[PDB]
Design a protein around this ligand. Structure first.
Ligand code: KBU
Ligand code: ZN
Ligand code: ZN
Length: 582
């Protein structure tokens, strides 16, 4: 308790001395309270006019229009320590898993050089804006690294000072840029050297990208077994138990020297002990500790979520296969079987799973999995939108399975070659493209974000009619040579000024390991759509008056935007479409 966290606590206490008080009406139970000090201040979702002007029919679809307008009583719930039988299975699996992830990997500290190169190309590392201003500035200053160094040597002694979380079904936990570095130095390797690639982790999909996920599920489907299950966990970050945080820490048994200690520090002092600063209108800043839950770097979170989820799902598989009988206690002769299962078939069982953070698809050996819930529910990994003890509804077709907000279509090119293409409700896709995050955007920046979306649609969602059209319109309405932008950057191959037909060929034909014939496609008309009825089901306006008026007169919308932007150099991309071709 207060020995490990109190130092950090005292330091803030003293900086806001003229304000301190123990508020006798503090709304926490599960969060350990400490006090309050005076503040007064807060970003909301602005509309992108380049994208909106070029998608007029949607100005009247509420599912689209509402997306641009607008539980903290779930971060304040407490998870129950698992049984002795559960806690044993988790610890055995974590060991075997970590060793497997490390069989062909070397843990290693990430560097200041690598950290600087991250910041000098916009990758949301979650910092605060105060002694400097932006991320860029502070990295180029030497004083910073003297503060970073103090804390680094502090960590080598097992004490912490400036590493405090800032809260703001999502809960974002911004840290000050220094503690970010040190979190990155120790654990960045997990991300940077791809510990959860599919090659390496067998269940994982890090670095895979939306044009592979579909092919991966279809490969999974090919295994002999039961239904594909895809259970969403209810508030996964909040259901991370202290035993989870401890099994994750077992990565350090793979380390040495300076590293092993620094890794051990981050886990000990920031992950398995926490300190956080939250707003409250009655306006103040409450300083609260808790020992468990997730509250890390958005990246490390991903890797450790994937790891613990991989673990849960091997175990739930075990309960289905009847490897263990009860979670109340493991017999010694049950350990020998649990251990031998992992060694005999564990790798094969990882290959029946596609896991991306809190998100999974399991094709288990049979449908006993569906009702194997004791370990799952006892680990705290309790299922969303279904009763605790009601068995899992599982999917019979891989083209129906939800995965990373998407579903995946099989789609036969006019030449017999097979595309597996990502997809989701068109109102969702068009709604996101109509939205920008932040203040002080120029028409040029707004235009270049519009372009980023258009090029994604062209690469990923070319098979949806409204999107190939809106995409050609946007790319026509925005100067040909202006570069796509994005303030919060998976593989993102649409971020480029290259010919989008050339990028398509490289991605879907040339580099696509599931495509044997490498015959490049010569024009967009060779590139097919979903069925017209399939397009409507996935939220197309094809067949409506308004949609046809829009298509008819598209060149008039394109010019409207061109007129606002100015006398630049523009290309007409609509003659790539059969119907705008004479
Ligand atoms: Cl002790 C231990 C950890 C991970 C994997 C293993 N295989 C055999 N023994 C093992
Ligand atoms: Zn620290
Ligand atoms: Zn679809």
């Amino acid at each position: 308790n207060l020995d490990i966290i109190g130092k950090r606590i005292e330091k803030i206490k003293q900086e806001h001395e003229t304000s301190w008080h123990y508020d006798q009406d503090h709304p926490y139970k599960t969060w350990a309270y400490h006090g309050s000090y005076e503040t007064k201040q807060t970003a909301s979702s602005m509309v992108n006019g380049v994208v909106r002007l070029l998608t007029k029919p949607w100005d009247i679809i509420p599912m689209v229009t509402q997306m641009a307008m607008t539980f903290k009583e779930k971060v304040d719930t407490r998870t129950q320590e698992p049984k002795e039988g559960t806690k044993k299975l988790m610890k055995i699996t974590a060991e075997w898993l970590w060793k497997e992830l490390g069989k062909k990997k070397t843990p290693r500290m990430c560097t200041r050089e690598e950290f600087t190169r991250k910041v000098r190309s916009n990758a949301a590392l979650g910092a605060i804006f105060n002694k400097w201003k932006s991320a860029r500035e502070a990295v180029e200053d030497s004083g910073f690294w003297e503060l970073v160094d103090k804390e680094r040597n502090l960590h080598l002694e097992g004490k912490c000072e400036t590493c405090v979380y800032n809260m703001m079904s999502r809960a974002i936990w911004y840290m000050w840029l220094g503690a970010r570095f040190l979190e990155f130095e120790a654990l960045g390797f997990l991300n940077e050297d791809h510990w959860f690639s599919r090659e390496n982790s067998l269940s994982g999909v890090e670095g895979e990208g939306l044009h592979k996920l579909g092919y991966i599920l279809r490969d999974v489907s090919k295994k002999e077994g039961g239904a594909m299950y895809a259970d969403d966990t209810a508030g996964w970050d909040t259901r991370i138990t202290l035993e989870d945080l401890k099994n994750e820490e077992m990565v350090t048994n793979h380390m040495e020297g300076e590293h092993k200690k620094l890794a051990e520090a981050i886990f000990k002092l920031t992950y398995q002990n926490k300190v956080v600063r939250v707003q409250r209108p009655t306006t103040v800043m409450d300083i609260i500790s808790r020992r468990d839950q997730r509250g890390s770097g958005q990246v490390v979170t991903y890797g450790l979520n994937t790891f613990t989820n991989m673990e849960a799902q091997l175990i739930r598989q075990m309960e289905g296969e009847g490897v263990f009988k009860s979670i109340q206690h493991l017999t010694v002769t049950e350990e020998i079987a649990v251990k031998n299962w992992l060694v005999r078939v564990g790798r094969e069982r990882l290959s029946r799973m596609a896991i991306s953070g809190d998100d999974c698809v399991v094709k288990p050996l049979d449908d006993r999995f569906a009702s194997a819930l004791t370990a799952l529910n006892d680990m705290g990994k309790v299922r969303k939108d279904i009763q605790q003890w009601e068995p899992s509804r599982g999917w019979n077709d891989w083209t129906q399975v939800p995965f990373c907000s998407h579903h995946f279509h099989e789609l036969i090119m006019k030449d017999g070659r097979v595309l597996v293409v990502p997809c989701r409700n068109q109102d969702e896709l068009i709604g996101r493209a109509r939205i920008s995050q932040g203040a002080g955007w120029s028409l040029r920046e707004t235009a270049c974000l519009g372009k980023s979306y258009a090029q994604m649609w062209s690469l990923m969602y070319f098979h949806r009619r409204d999107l190939r059209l809106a995409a050609n319109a946007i790319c026509s309405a925005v100067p040909s040579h202006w570069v796509p932008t994005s303030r919060t950057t998976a593989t993102h191959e649409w971020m480029t000024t290259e010919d989008m037909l050339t990028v398509w060929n490289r991605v879907w034909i040339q580099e696509n390991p599931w495509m044997e014939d490498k015959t490049p496609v010569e024009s967009w008309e060779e590139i097919p759509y979903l069925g017209k009825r399939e397009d409507q089901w996935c939220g197309s306006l094809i067949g409506l008056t308004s949609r046809a008026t829009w298509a008819k007169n598209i060149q008039t919308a394109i010019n409207q935007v061109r007129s606002l932007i100015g006398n630049e150099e523009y290309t007409d991309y609509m003659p790539s479409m059969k119907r705008f071709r004479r």
